Amino acid sequence: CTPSR
Amino acid sequence: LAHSKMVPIPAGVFTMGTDDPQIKQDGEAPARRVTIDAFYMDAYEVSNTEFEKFVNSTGYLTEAEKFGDSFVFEGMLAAAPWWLPVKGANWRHPEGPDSTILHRPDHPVLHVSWNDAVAYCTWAGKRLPTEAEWEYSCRGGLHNRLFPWGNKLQPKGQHYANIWQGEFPVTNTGEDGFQGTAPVDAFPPNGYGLYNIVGNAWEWTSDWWTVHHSVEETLNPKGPPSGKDRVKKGGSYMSHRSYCYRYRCAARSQNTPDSSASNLGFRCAADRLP
Numbered sequence A: 001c002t003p004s005r
Numbered sequence B: 001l002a003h004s005k006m007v008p009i010p011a012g013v014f015t016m017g018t019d020d021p022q023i024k025q026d027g028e029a030p031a032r033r034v035t036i037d038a039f040y041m042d043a044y045e046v047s048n049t050e051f052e053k054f055v056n057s058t059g060y061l062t063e064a065e066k067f068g069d070s071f072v073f074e075g076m077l078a079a080a081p082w083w084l085p086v087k088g089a090n091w092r093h094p095e096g097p098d099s100t101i102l103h104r105p106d107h108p109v110l111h112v113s114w115n116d117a118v119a120y121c122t123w124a125g126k127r128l129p130t131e132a133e134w135e136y137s138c139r140g141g142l143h144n145r146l147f148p149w150g151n152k153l154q155p156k157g158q159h160y161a162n163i164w165q166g167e168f169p170v171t172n173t174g175e176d177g178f179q180g181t182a183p184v185d186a187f188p189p190n191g192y193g194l195y196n197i198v199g200n201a202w203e204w205t206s207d208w209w210t211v212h213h214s215v216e217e218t219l220n221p222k223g224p225p226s227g228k229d230r231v232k233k234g235g236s237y238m239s240h241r242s243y244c245y246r247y248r249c250a251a252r253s254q255n256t257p258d259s260s261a262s263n264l265g266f267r268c269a270a271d272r273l274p
């Protein structure tokens, strides 16, 4: 849902 | 505008998680009874304007600015093909260098990492909420409901949160009035006076991420003492039943604390009024 850096 | 106002979240006991998990791999289960002491929660996601006050005061450079990129959803121009690491995307330029926040000062700040959020909240005399505090607050005084307002997504035929309508990721119809973010004071408040606690921007919490929870009753739990990802809650304007059904209070996801994205922001909490 949000990529990690 | 009082977009840094806080509301008193009352002392109470609530059921955290659910014994009917919808995304089992995220450790939505088991349901567990958690006692939370009275505290204060930001009524709103931290807005661009509020974040700008922090940056004006401190000179703070966000991690995305220092790294020189951040994740942007392809639809507005990685974890998924629709997430692109965009050079020069950061809180001031949410879709990259030739985007601006000038027209959306009251929208939630984005591309803020966990560290950025902790910096802001502490500057503000506040802190991140724990996951349990966040979920308790999200639930808005209702027991075992999907959403802050209940179990129907569109109660009374009204949109109650800014999520995705249409076929993700190809088509966002903007039926709920917002394709990207909405103002932090958009949509109805929940029972505790919180706006956009589900949808709009994802929200960082203080907890390290684990999917392994005890059914033991707990008091003001802080999450596990160690981890690699911090917990985020609530879903975003990209959330949809079909692929990221996380606009539920019990839902949960994670990112490494240096992570930033165009759908991820935060709000603060405090033990007492700052």
Ligand SMILES: *[C@@H]1O[C@H](CO)[C@@H](O[C@@H]2O[C@H](CO)[C@@H](O)[C@H](O)[C@H]2NC(C)=O)[C@H](O)[C@H]1NC(C)=O
Pocket: B049, B050, B052, B053, B056
């Ligand atoms: C953050 O600081 C900037 C720069 O000082 C503020 O913008 C200026 O504010 C002054 C004082 O009111 C105005 O006279 C100028 O027109 C502004 N200049 C620029 C470059 O925009 C800004 O208002 C501050 N933001 C917040 C949220 O407090």
Ligand SMILES: [Br-]
Pocket: A001, A002, A003, B079, B080, B244
């Ligand atoms: Br995603």
Ligand SMILES: [Br-]
Pocket: B021, B024, B029
């Ligand atoms: Br499970």
Ligand SMILES: [Br-]
Pocket: B098, B099, B100, B101
């Ligand atoms: Br823009």
Ligand SMILES: [Br-]
Pocket: B102, B103
């Ligand atoms: Br303007």
Ligand SMILES: [Br-]
Pocket: B103, B104, B105, B106, B107, B183
């Ligand atoms: Br605005």
Ligand SMILES: [Br-]
Pocket: B118, B119, B122, B123
């Ligand atoms: Br700090």
Ligand SMILES: [Br-]
Pocket: B118, B121, B122, B126, B127, B128, B206
């Ligand atoms: Br904190």
Ligand SMILES: [Br-]
Pocket: B017, B018, B144, B145, B146, B250
């Ligand atoms: Br639930």
Ligand SMILES: [Br-]
Pocket: B149, B150, B151, B152, B153, B155
């Ligand atoms: Br309902």
Ligand SMILES: [Br-]
Pocket: B177, B185, B186, B187
């Ligand atoms: Br609205």
Ligand SMILES: [Br-]
Pocket: B215, B216, B217
């Ligand atoms: Br127990």
Ligand SMILES: [Br-]
Pocket: A001, A002, B235, B236, B237, B238, B239, B244, B263
């Ligand atoms: Br999402």
Ligand SMILES: [Br-]
Pocket: B115, B257, B258
């Ligand atoms: Br870090």
Ligand SMILES: [Br-]
Pocket: B125, B126, B127, B269, B270, B271, B272
């Ligand atoms: Br505090």
Ligand SMILES: [Ca+2]
Pocket: B162, B163, B164, B165, B174, B175, B176, B177, B178, B179, B180, B237
């Ligand atoms: Ca929407």
